[PDB]
PDB file of C-alpha atoms in Angstrom:
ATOM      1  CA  UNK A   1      68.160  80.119  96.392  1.00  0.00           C
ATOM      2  CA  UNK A   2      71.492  79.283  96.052  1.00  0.00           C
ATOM      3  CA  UNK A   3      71.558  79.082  92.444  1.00  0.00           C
ATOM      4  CA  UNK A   4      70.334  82.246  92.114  1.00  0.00           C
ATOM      5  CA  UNK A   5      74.445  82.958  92.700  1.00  0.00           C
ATOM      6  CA  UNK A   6      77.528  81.148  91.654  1.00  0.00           C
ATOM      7  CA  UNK A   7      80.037  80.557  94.508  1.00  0.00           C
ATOM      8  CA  UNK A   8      79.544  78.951  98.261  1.00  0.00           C
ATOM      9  CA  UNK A   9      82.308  81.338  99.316  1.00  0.00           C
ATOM     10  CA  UNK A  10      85.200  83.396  98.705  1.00  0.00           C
ATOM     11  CA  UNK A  11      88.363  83.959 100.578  1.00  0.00           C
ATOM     12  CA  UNK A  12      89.633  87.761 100.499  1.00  0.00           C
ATOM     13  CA  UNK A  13      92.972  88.394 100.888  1.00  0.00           C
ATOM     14  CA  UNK A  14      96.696  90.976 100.350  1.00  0.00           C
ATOM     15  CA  UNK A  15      99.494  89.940  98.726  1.00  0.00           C
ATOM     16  CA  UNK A  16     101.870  87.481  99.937  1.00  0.00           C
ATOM     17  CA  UNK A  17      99.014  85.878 101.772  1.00  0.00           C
ATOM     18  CA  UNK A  18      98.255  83.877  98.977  1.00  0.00           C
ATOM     19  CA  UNK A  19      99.465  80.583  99.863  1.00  0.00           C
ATOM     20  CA  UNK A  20      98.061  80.600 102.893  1.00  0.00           C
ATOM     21  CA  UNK A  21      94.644  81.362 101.522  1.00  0.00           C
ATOM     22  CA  UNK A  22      94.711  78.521  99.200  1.00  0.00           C
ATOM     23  CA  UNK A  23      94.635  76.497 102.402  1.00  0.00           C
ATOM     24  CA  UNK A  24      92.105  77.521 103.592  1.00  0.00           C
ATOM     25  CA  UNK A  25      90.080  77.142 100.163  1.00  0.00           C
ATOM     26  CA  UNK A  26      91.257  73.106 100.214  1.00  0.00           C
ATOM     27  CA  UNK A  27      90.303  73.131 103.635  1.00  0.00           C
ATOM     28  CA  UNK A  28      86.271  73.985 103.004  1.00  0.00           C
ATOM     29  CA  UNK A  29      86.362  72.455  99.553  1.00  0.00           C
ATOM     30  CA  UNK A  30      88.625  69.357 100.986  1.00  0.00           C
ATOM     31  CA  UNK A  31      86.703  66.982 103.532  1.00  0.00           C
ATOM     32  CA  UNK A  32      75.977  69.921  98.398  1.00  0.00           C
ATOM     33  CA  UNK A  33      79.374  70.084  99.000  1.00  0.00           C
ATOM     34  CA  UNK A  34      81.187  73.529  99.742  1.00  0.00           C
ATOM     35  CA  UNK A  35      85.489  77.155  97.307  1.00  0.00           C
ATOM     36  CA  UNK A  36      87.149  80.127  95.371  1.00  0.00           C
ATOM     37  CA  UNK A  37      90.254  82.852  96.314  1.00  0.00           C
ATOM     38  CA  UNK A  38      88.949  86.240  95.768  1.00  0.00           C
ATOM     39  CA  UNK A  39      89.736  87.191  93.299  1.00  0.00           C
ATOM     40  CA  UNK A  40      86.878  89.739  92.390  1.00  0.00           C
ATOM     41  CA  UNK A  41      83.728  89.523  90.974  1.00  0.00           C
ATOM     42  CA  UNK A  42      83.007  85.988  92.511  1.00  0.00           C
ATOM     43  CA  UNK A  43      79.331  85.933  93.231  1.00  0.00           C
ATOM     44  CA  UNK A  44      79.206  84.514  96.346  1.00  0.00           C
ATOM     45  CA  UNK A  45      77.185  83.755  99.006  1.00  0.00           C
ATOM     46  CA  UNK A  46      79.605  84.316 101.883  1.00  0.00           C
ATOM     47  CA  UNK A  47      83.212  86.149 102.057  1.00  0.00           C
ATOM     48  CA  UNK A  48      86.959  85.634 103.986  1.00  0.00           C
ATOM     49  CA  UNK A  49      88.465  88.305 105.255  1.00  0.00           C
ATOM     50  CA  UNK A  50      91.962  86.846 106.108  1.00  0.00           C
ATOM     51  CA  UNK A  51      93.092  90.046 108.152  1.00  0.00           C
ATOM     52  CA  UNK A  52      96.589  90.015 108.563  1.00  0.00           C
ATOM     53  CA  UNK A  53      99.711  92.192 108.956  1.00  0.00           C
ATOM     54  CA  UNK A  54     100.479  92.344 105.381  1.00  0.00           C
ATOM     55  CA  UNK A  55      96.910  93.330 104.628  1.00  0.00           C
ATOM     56  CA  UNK A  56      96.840  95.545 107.347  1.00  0.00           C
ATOM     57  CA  UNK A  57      99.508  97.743 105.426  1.00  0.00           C
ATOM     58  CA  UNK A  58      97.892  96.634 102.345  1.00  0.00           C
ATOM     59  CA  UNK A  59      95.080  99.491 102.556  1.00  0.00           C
ATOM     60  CA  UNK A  60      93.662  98.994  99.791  1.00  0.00           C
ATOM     61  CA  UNK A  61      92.091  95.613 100.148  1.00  0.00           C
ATOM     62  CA  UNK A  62      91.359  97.587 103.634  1.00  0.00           C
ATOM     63  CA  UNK A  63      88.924  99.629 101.524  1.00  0.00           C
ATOM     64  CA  UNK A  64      87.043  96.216 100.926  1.00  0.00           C
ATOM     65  CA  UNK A  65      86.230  95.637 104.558  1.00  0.00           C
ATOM     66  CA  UNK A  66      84.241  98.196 104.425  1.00  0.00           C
ATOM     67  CA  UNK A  67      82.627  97.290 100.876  1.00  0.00           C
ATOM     68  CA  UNK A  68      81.505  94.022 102.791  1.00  0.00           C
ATOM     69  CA  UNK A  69      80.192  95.801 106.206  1.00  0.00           C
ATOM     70  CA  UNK A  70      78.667  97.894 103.984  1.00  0.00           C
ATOM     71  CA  UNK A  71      75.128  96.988 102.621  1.00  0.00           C
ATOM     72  CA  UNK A  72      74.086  89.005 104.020  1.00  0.00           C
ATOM     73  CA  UNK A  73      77.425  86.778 105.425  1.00  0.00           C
ATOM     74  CA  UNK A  74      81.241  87.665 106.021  1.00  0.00           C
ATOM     75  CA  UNK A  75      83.924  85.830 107.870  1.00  0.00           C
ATOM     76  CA  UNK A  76      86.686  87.774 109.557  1.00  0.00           C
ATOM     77  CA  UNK A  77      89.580  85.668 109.703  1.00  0.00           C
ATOM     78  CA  UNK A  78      91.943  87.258 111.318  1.00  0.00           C
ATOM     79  CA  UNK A  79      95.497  85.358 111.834  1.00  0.00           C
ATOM     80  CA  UNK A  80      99.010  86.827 113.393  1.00  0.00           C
ATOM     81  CA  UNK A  81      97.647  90.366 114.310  1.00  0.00           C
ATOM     82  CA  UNK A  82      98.133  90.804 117.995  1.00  0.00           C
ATOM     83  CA  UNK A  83      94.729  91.360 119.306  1.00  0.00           C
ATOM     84  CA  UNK A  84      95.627  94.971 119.620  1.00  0.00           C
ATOM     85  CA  UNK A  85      95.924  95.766 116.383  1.00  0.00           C
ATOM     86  CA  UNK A  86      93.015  94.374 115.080  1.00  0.00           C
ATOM     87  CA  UNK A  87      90.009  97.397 113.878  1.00  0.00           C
ATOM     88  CA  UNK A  88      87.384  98.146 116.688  1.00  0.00           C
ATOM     89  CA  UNK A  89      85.032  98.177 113.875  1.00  0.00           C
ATOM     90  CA  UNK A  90      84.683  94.436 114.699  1.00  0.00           C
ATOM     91  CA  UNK A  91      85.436  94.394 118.786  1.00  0.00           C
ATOM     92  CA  UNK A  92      81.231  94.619 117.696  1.00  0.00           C
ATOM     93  CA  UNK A  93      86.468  83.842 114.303  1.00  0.00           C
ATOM     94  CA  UNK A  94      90.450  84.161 116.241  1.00  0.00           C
ATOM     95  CA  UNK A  95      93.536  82.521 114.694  1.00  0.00           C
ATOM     96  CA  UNK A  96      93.996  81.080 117.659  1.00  0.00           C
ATOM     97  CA  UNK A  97      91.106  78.510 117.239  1.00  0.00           C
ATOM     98  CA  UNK A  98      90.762  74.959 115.969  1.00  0.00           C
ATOM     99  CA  UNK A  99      93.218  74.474 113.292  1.00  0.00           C
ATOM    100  CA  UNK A 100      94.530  77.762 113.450  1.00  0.00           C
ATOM    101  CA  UNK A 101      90.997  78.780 113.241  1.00  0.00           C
ATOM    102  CA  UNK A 102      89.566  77.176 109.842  1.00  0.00           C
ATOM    103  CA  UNK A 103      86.924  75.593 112.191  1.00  0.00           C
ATOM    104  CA  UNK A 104      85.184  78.125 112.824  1.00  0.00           C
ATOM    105  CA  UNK A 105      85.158  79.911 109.582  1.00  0.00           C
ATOM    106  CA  UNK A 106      83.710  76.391 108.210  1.00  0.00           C
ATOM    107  CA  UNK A 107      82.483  75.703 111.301  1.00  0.00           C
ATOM    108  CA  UNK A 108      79.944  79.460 111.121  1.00  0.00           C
ATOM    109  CA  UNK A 109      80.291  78.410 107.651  1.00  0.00           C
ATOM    110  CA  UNK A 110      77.503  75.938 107.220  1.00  0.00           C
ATOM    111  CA  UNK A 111      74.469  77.975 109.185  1.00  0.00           C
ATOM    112  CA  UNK A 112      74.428  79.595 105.716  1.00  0.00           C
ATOM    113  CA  UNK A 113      73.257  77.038 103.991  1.00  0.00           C
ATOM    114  CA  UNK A 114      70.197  76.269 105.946  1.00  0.00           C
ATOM    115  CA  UNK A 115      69.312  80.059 104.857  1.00  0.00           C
ATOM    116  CA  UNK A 116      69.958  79.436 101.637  1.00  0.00           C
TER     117      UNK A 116
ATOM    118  CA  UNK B   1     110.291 115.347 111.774  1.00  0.00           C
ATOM    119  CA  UNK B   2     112.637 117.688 109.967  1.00  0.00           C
ATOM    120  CA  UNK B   3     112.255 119.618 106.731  1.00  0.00           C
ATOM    121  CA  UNK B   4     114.374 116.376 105.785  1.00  0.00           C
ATOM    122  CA  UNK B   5     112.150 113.464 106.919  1.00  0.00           C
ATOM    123  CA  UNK B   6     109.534 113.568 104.002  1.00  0.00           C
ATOM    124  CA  UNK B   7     110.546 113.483 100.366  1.00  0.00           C
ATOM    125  CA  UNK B   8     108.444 116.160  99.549  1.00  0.00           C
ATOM    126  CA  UNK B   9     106.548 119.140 100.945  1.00  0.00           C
ATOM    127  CA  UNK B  10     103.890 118.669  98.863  1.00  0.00           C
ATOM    128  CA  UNK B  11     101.345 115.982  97.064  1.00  0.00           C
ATOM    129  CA  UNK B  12      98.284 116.568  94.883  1.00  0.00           C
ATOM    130  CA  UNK B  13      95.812 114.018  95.019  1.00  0.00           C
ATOM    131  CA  UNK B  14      93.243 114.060  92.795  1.00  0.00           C
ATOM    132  CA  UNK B  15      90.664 111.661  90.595  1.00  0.00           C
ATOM    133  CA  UNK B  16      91.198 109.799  87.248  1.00  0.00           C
ATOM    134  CA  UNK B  17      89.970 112.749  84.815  1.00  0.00           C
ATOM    135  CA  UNK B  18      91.143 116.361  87.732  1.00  0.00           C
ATOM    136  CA  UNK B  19      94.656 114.763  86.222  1.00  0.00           C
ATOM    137  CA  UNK B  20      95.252 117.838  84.077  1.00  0.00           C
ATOM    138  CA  UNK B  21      94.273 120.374  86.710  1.00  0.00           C
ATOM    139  CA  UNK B  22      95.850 118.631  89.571  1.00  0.00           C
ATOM    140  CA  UNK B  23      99.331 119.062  87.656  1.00  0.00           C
ATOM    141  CA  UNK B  24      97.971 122.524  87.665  1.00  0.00           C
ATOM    142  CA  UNK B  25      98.346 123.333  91.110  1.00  0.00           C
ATOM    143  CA  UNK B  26     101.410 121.172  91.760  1.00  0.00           C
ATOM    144  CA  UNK B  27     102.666 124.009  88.595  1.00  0.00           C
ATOM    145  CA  UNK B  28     101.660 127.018  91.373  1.00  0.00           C
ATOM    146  CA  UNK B  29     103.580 125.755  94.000  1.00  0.00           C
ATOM    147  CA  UNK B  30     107.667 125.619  93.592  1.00  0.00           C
ATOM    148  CA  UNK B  31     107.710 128.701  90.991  1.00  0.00           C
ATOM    149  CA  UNK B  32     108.977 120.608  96.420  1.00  0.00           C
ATOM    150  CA  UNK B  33     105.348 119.460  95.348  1.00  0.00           C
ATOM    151  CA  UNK B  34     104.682 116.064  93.568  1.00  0.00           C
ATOM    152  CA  UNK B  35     101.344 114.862  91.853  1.00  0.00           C
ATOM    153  CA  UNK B  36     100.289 111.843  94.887  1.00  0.00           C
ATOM    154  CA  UNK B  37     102.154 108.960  93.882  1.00  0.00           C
ATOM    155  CA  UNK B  38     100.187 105.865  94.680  1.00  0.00           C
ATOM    156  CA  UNK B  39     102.320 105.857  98.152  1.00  0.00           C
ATOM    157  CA  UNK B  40     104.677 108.453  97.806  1.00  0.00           C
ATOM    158  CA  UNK B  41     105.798 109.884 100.653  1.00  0.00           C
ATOM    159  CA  UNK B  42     105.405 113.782 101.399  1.00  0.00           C
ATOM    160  CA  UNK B  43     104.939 116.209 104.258  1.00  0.00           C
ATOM    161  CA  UNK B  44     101.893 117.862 102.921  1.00  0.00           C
ATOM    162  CA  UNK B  45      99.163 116.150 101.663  1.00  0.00           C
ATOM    163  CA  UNK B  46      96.898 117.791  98.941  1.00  0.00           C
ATOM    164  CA  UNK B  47      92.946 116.438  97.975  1.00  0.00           C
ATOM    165  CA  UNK B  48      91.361 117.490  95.244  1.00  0.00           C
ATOM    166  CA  UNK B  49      87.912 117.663  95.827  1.00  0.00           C
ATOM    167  CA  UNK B  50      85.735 118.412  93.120  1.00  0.00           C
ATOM    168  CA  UNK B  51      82.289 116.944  91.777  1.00  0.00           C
ATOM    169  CA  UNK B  52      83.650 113.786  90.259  1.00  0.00           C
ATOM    170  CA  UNK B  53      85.828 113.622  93.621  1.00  0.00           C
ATOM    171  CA  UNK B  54      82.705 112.891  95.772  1.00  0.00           C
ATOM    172  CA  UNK B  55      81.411 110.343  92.957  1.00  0.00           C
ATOM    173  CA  UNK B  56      84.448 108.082  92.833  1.00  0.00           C
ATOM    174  CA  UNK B  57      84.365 105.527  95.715  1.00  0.00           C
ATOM    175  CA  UNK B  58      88.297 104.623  95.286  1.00  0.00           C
ATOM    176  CA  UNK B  59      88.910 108.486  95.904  1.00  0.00           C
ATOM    177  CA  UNK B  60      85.662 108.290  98.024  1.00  0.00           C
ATOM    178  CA  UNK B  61      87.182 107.186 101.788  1.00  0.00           C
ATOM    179  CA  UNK B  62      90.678 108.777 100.737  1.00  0.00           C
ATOM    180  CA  UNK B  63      89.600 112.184 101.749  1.00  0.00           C
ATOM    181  CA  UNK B  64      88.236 110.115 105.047  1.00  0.00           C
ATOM    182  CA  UNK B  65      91.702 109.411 105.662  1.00  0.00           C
ATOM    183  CA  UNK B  66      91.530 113.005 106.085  1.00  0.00           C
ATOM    184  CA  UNK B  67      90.478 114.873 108.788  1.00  0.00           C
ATOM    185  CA  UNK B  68      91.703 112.087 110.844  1.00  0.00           C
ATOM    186  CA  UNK B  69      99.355 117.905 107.108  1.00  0.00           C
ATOM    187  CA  UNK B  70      96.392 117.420 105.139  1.00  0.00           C
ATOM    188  CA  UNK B  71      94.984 120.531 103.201  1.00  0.00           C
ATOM    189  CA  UNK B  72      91.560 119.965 101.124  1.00  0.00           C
ATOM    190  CA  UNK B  73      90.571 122.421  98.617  1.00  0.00           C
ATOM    191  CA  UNK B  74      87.274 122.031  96.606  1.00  0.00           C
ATOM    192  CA  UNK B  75      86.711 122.834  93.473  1.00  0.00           C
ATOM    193  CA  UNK B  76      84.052 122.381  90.628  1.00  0.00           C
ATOM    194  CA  UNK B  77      81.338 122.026  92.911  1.00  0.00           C
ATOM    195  CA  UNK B  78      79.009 124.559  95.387  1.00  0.00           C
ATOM    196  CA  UNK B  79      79.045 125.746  98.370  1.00  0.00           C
ATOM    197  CA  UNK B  80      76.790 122.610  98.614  1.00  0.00           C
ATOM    198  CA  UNK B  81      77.654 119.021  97.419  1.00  0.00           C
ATOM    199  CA  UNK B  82      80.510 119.721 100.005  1.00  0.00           C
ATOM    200  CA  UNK B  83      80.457 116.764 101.958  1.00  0.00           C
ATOM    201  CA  UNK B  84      79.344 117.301 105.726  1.00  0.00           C
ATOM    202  CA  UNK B  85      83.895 119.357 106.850  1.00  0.00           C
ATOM    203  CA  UNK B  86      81.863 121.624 108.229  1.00  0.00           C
ATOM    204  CA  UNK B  87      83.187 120.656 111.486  1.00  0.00           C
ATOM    205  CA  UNK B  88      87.021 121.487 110.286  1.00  0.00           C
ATOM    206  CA  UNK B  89      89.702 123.199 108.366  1.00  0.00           C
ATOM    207  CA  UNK B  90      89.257 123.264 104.276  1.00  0.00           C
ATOM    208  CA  UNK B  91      90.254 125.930 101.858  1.00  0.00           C
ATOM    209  CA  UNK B  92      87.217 126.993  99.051  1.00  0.00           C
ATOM    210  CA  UNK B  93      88.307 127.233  95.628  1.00  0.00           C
ATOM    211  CA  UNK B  94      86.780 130.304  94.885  1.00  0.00           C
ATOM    212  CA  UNK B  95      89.793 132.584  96.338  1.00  0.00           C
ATOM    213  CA  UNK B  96      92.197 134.211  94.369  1.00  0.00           C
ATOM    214  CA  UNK B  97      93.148 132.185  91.365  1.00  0.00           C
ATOM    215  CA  UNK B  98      90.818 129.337  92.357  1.00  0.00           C
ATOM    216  CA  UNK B  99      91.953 128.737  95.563  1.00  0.00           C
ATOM    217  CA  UNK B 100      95.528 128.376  95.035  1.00  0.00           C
ATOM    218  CA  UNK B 101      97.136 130.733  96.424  1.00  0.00           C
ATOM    219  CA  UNK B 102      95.370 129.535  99.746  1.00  0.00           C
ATOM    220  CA  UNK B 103      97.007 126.329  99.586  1.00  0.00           C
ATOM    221  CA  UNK B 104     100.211 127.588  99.014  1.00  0.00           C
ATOM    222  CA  UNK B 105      99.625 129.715 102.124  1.00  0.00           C
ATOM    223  CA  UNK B 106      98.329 126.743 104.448  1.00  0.00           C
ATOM    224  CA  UNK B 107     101.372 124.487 103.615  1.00  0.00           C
ATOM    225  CA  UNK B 108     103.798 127.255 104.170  1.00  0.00           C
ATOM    226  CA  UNK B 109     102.412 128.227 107.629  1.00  0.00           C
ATOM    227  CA  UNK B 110     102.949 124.455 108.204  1.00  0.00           C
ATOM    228  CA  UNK B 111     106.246 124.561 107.663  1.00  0.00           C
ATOM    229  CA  UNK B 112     107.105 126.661 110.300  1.00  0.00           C
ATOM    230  CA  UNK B 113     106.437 123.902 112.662  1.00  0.00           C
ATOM    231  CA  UNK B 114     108.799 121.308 111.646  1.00  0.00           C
TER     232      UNK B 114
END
């Protein structure tokens, strides 16, 4: 059903974190094939949430965590926050992982596929 | 901290289209208060609550901030519609001249403290 919607994924980040999120777009896209920076409106079938400290103080893409939790697949990648700092709302993938952690992401990735 | 530690005393926040009577209260006041400047900072923080308030998403989850100095005043909608601050602190803008005068008295007994 995938056509039903345009894009495999979409990586969500702040500002500044943009370079960074471009590699992880190359990295999914780079190896039915799998990628697009978000960058709104992207129908997609699964999300990034590259939480970092940046984005942290950037509240407003903050708002969007919620938009995602709320109302289905989402990726929290979360890279250079202590794991203090880090919202409880998800102690219920670790930048400490395989390649920093874009295993993972790729790696819980695929199961998607099979469901769509 | 001090009574010098926060720009201003006051900020009005308030939706899109409660712009012209959110420059209204901020007009009450003084007679320092500030219409909410996308991160401005301030002491006092002022929402605007009114029917479009609660319809508006963006705004919506700004007032959550709240609760959470933060005075809300509500306005334009019933006693009902009022979204379930029951458990807290608000100030109904039905009081003398709409609830303004109230607001005015909130901040200034929170001034005190600093």
């Amino acid at each position: 059903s995938r056509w039903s919607k345009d894009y495999d994924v979409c990586v969500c980040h702040s500002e500044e974190d943009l370079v960074a999120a471009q590699d992880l777009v190359s990295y999914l896209e780079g190896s039915g094939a799998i990628s697009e920076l978000c960058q709104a409106l992207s129908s997609s079938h699964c999300r990034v949430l590259l939480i970092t400290p940046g984005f942290l103080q950037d509240p407003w893409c903050k708002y969007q965590m919620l938009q995602a939790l709320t109302e289905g697949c989402t990726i929290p990648l979360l890279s250079g926050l202590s794991r203090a700092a880090y919202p409880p709302e998800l102690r219920f993938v670790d930048g400490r992982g395989p390649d920093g952690g874009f295993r993972q992401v790729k790696e819980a990735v695929m199961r998607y596929l099979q469901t769509l």
